[PDB]
Amino acid sequence: MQIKTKGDLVRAALRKLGVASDATLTDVEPQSMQDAVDDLEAMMAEWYQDGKGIITGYVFSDDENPPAEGDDHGLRSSAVSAVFHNLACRIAPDYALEATAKIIATAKYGKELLYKQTAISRAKRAPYPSRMPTGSGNSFANLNEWHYFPGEQ
Amino acid sequence: MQIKTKGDLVRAALRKLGVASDATLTDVEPQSMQDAVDDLEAMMAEWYQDGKGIITGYVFSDDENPPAEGDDHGLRSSAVSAVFHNLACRIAPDYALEATAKIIATAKYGKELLYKQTAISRAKRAPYPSRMPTGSGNSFANLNEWHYFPGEQ
Amino acid sequence: TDITANVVVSNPRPIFTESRSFKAVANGKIYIGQIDTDPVNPANQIPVYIENEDGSHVQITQPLIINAAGKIVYNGQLVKIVTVQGHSMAIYDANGSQVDYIANVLKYDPDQYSIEADKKFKYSVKLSDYPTLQDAASAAVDGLLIDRD
Amino acid sequence: ANVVVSNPRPIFTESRSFKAVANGKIYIGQIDTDPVNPANQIPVYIENEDGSHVQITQPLIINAAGKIVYNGQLVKIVTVQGHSMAIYDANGSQVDYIANVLKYDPDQYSIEADKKFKYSVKLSDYPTLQDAASAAVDGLLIDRDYNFY
Amino acid sequence: TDITANVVVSNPRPIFTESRSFKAVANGKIYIGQIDTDPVNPANQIPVYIENEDGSHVQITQPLIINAAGKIVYNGQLVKIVTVQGHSMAIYDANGSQVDYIANVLKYDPDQYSIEADKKFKYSVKLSDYPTLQDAASAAVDGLLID
């Protein structure tokens, strides 16, 4: 994928913003990288919300390793194009730059695609209520004295 | 998390506003940091409303330890990305700046996600009224002379 | 053995912390005054200089301001403060209490025998210890001695 | 414009982490020896700002900030001989060991230097000529251009 | 009473902490060079010597590592890393970000005053110290004094 490391995400976001790339002759300054990776960790910690949020493969650094830029991230190949686009949309307030509308639309699309699979997987129907008889057609649960549904428990 | 202390939130807000960060030549005078910390404490006390408002892990300075900027904040990792964005939004009138629209949207999203879990947990249904009979199908509460529901009490 | 090596690599910016807990004093005033005197009184204070890169020493107001990092700060930036040795130090918190008070900073010196010993002897370099003549002559005060090498 | 302003108060921190060694213990022993055993140590003394000295029990304690404290106030501790210190945490682990805080022994070397050096004094350290001559023996230097009256 | 004071209990290890915050430099690098120059380039660097527990010096490479506590680590915590002359300090952070840069720094070694005193003063054994004259002359070097 060639975007294995968090530093790759930061560099891609900066290049998208036009701050530091090779298409523009400027280079990345380390403190910008540190600020961007801190902001990326903060943003990613808000989306997951301990599980009740957007579920994506991501490893949060325990800070045992001091340099958090070089370590790997567990993002699946489909979420990368959303994560760094959202990161680039968020970073621009740090400078006076404003993100282009294309980046905003791409971030919207990426987040929607991120959450759609979990939305499909989490749409489950509730069981039968406790006071609902099972009709005389079952003929086995009816013979086992188990006339009524157990309930939501 | 690298944002353990309150001064870390203040510095993150200042960086997001672009006033001062690590890679800037000029820096703000410590009385500005003290004023920002006082404003942050005021903001967090107004949301709590004494247990009846937004509930998040937060410890208020007891004033016995002199520097309230240095002590740690009990915020969980998910609320950090909202607290300093809101602090940066409130700090803009302190200077001559005005907060960018992206920061406003991020603060809105952060507060909504802060309150959604408490809103889910506080949506409870009241018990049965006082003058509501229990039907003849219970067969145990009916035989225990307890024909009617107790009430909200 | 290899060389004189009289210079120690250490922290070049001083750090001031609280007395009751472990956290840097934020917005805490620092006062500097004469020996065994109260620096809070403006009559007992001594000039305090900022040493820029150029070597020019610029005097500043007596109450020095600390930042959230625990280091002396002028107008938001870290500075190097140099004063005449022998100054009492009084650190005050932002609230207005007293963190520390030191009558003589020269007393908080790991080696105090050297101060007493320096007074009561004569200084004269021996030619034996130094390798060459110029090195002995340069560091020579109050006469020399002529020995082997 | 000679000595940089710095905090001379000692702060004791852990070796492998940024902590304050809360409620630690410091043992001041004899030169190049282990001070844990109770037989092999030297007396320690408090030095107040005025100049009085008080005898102190061996197991020096550390405050929550990381500074030595006696009763409820920060103190300064002075020993007469050279010593080896050993800092321990609250759980009994070893934080740091120094065989020689000073590589030489001040007392024996002081006696030797008294034996093998001349006792002449200079005027530079002493404000007045009479004060210099009062404590001067075996010689005097007239260093500075002393004014007659 | 008022007993003589010779040595005070003090911490002999320095801590390097990040400016603008109260954190310790995790695994930064310290570059030591000439007075008003850039310590990064090889030309401006100056020799750096360890000081062991016993008097001895071992030279090491210029970039100095820092452990999590903020003290220079080497393999185990290293003692006083004494250099010569007045150097310029250029502390870098873990990911190559400049923490602080200072032009002129000079702090003298408090240890080993015996060697400096021996190299400083001149010898006069006197006569009151020794009982007789022969033993006094035996230990007399480049001088002698009478009662």
UniProtKB/TrEMBL annotation, chains A, B:
Pfam families, A to Z: P22_Tail-4
Protein name as annotated: P22 tail accessory factor
Organism: Salmonella typhimurium
Origin organism lineage: Bacteria, Pseudomonadati, Pseudomonadota, Gammaproteobacteria, Enterobacterales
TrEMBL record, chain E:
Positions in coiled-coil regions: none
Boundaries of every Bacteriophage P22 tailspike N-terminal domain copy: 1-112
The name this protein goes by in its record: Endorhamnosidase
Organism of provenance: Salmonella typhimurium
Upper lineage: Bacteria, Pseudomonadati, Pseudomonadota, Gammaproteobacteria, Enterobacterales
